Amino acid sequence: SILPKRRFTEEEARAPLPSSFDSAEAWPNCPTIPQIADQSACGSCWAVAAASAMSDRFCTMGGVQDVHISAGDLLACCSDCGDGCNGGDPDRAWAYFSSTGLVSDYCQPYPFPHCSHHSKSKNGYPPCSQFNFDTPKCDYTCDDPTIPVVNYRSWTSYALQGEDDYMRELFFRGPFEVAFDVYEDFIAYNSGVYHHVSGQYLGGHAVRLVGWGTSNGVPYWKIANSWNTEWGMDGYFLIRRGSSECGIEDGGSAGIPL
Ligand SMILES: *[C@@H](C(=O)N[C@H](C(=O)N1CCC[C@H]1C(=O)O)[C@@H](C)CC)[C@H](O)C(=O)NCCC
Ligand SMILES: [Mg+2]
């Protein structure tokens, strides 16, 4: 990783982590945590999962209860993180938050509308397959220019790897970004603990880790996807935990809001 690897203190290391955990239950006064994102018809998962977690950490660590960090700013402005709507790099996203900073979604609201991701929408959202969205130009003022820019930064960023690092980081500091290999069987997930069994490789996908538990003897992670609440289990999926299912334990990205 381009990031330094997380080191836990002796006290953090010996915490006896519970058999289940849910970020929204751990920090009930942090309203961003249960909010599910919609990346729209743009391959910006890397920036949306990052911004969502950054928002959550503003509340779990940074003393700010309800600031939504702008995924739009990240995806348009961190040209070196990757290629905007054509995908990008979670670790570089967190580094940018530390080196450069991000405005809120009040300053720069997400530029792309709700759409239905691999299903028919009860809300009446058009299918994402109908939209042709390029990366927007980076803007350095608010969309409404009478709103003053407030640039938010982290003071440090770091990488996590493996089941214990993930559980322990989540327990102490709250949601963070992870990535995994998407196969076609993931797309129609609705319930259960996901495990890859069929379907072709479709690409890498970055998502926000929020909890863990065990369901009928099967350990899992609880993950917030970015495909709105109509996908999966109210916008979430559970996925197997412990043997890096689809690579999901191979690398997490995090940091600490100032
Ligand atoms: C991650 C990403 O955005 N992935 C895509 C995605 O979720 N999309 C594309 C169109 C809307 C939405 C959808 O499928 O409903 C897609 C390739 C998943 C099948 C992005 O590609 C990226 O940055 N990946 C690298 C992460 C390390
Ligand atoms: Mg001690």
Author numbering: 78 to 335
According to the publication:
Bloodstream T. brucei parasites express two papain family cysteine proteases, rhodesain (brucipain, trypanopain), a cathepsin L-like enzyme and TbCatB, a cathepsin B-like enzyme. TbCatB may therefore represent the more promising target for novel cysteine protease inhibitors targeting T. brucei infection.
The TbCatB•CA074 complex crystallized in spacegroup P21 with two molecules in the asymmetric unit and was refined to 1.60Å resolution to a final Rfree of 17.8% and Rfactor of 14.7%. Chains A and B comprise residues 78–335 and 78–337 of full-length TbCatB, respectively. With the predicted maturation cleavage site of the enzyme between Pro93 and Leu94, we were surprised to observe that our crystal structure of the activated, mature form of TbCatB contains an additional 16 residues at the N-terminus preceding the predicted site of activation. Furthermore, the extension in TbCatB establishes several polar and hydrophobic interactions with the L and R domains of the main α/β fold, as is observed in structures of FP-2 and FP-3 (although this results in the malarial extensions adopting more extended secondary structure). While a number of hydrogen bonds are formed between residues lining the substrate-binding site and the inhibitor backbone, a number of hydrophobic residues also provide binding energy, principally in the S2 subsite, the subsite that confers selectivity for this class of enzyme. TbCatB has a Gly at this position, which opens up the pocket allowing larger P2 substituents to be targeted to this part of the active site cleft. In our structure Asp258175 and Asp327244 are available for binding and in each copy of TbCatB interact with a glycerol molecule from the cryoprotectant solution. In TbCatB, the loop is three residues longer than in mammalian homologs and we note a dual peptide conformation between His 194110 and His195111. The corresponding motif in TbCatB, “FNFD”, lacks this flexibility and both Phe208121 and Phe210123 stack with the N-terminal residue (Phe189105) of the occluding loop, creating a more stable opening around S1′.
